[PDB]
Design a protein around this ligand. Structure first.
Ligand SMILES: [Zn+2]
Ligand SMILES: [Zn+2]
Ligand SMILES: [Zn+2]
Lengths: 114, 114, 114
């Protein structure tokens, strides 16, 4: 899994330990080994949500499998919870795009997962 | 809908009001309420288009529906027009990837849009 | 084709000529003219791979065609090779997501590629 969060929250408002928390919780929620989880946080962005520059987040989760209606609801509850608690972003100002990747379309270690 | 533009144009060359203009025009083009539109501009990037570093833009539009051949032509005319007029980027140095998302694959407010 | 690499390697560690090298190598690999290749490098990112903040890269390649099982293995060897040689990133700390785009879903020059 690869998770990116783009946010207008400033860098100093991203708490120490946040990438590690993301990694741990995504490993558990997806069932994937932590070694395969990548996370990326992009603060200080020029963004708006509903025309408003109040705190917001635009995110993507790519995974080989483990994507679907019920799973995605679970991930959203988890991730919006983290963004609210750690970054003080309202859940109704977060979008997360979920992408189920075919193994043949993910490169890693000089090859692909197919 | 959510729109990102990545560009090598400097931040100081992004005019005041640009995010609001994007929001408004995307609402109008997609037919979706502006409260549902998110926009993100990333200036000062290290980028090349066709081997050179004159102003350029690489963009993504994710939407739950409202994506298709004729619609996408209309979005491109709109968005390239805005990038040309406001950021002084030539339309032939803009790529826009259009992604039609399933509602179950978009997280928002602790759940999905399903 | 368009290629983005997001990395925690610092900007000063990105060699002069890297964008040009990516452009030329992608043109050769995809068989597309360099005029159609766009490249984007984003250094200094807050990211982790497997919970670790050692050097890593998270990448995307979007192309209209030229994506598939064998082609993607070849691109992965090529691109991991470049990131190892030029940015000193281990191949086992690189993910590349390959996205085969329909021509009608790529905007350019006020229209689409359809
Ligand atoms: Zn996406
Ligand atoms: Zn895309
Ligand atoms: Zn992707």
């Amino acid at each position: 899994p690869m998770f990116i969060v783009n946010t207008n929250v400033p860098r100093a408002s991203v708490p120490d330990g946040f990438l590690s928390e993301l990694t741990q919780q995504l490993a558990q929620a997806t069932g994937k080994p932590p070694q395969y989880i990548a996370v990326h946080v992009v603060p200080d962005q020029l963004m708006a949500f509903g025309g408003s520059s109040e705190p917001c987040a635009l995110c993507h989760l790519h995974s080989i499998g483990k994507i679907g209606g019920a799973q995605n609801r679970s991930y959203s509850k988890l991730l919006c919870g983290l963004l609210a608690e750690r970054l003080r972003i309202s859940p109704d100002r977060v979008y997360i795009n979920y992408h189920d990747m075919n193994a043949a379309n993910v490169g890693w270690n000089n090859s692909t997962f197919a």
